[PDB]
Amino acid sequence: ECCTSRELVEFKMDRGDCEAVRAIENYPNGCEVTICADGVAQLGAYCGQGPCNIFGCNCDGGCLSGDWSQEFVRRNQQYGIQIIKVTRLPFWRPL
Ligand SMILES: [Ca+2]
Ligand SMILES: [Ca+2]
Numbered sequence: 865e866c867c868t869s870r871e872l873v874e875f876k877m878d879r880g881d882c883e884a885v886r887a888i889e890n891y892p893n894g895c896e897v898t899i900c901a902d903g904v905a906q907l908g909a910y911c912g913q914g915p916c917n918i919f920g921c922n923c924d925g926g927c928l929s930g931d932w933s934q935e936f937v938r939r940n941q942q943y944g945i946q947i948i949k950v951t952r953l954p955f956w957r958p959l
Contacts, residue, residue, distance in 0.1 A: 867911040867927035868920035871899050872951040873936060878944025885940045894948070900928040903935025 882895035886905035900911035913925030
């Protein structure tokens, strides 16, 4: 299994600041984060449940699972996440 997909999410917060959800600041009052499908900021390079190889494949446990940016919103509902852009990467699969 390969787990190279991720989402770059640009958002604002009705309460709190970007670091509270493991995000960076993106210009005054904006935040940005890269997430796996579980709606949590990436811990690494790839979105395996456990380690992948350098290609992002042969991922132990397969991929992290979830509802992508919608799960990021739900997990962090106490901050009131206002998504302004979502970009799913890569844009296509090799071949
Ligand atoms: Ca598969
Ligand atoms: Ca859903």
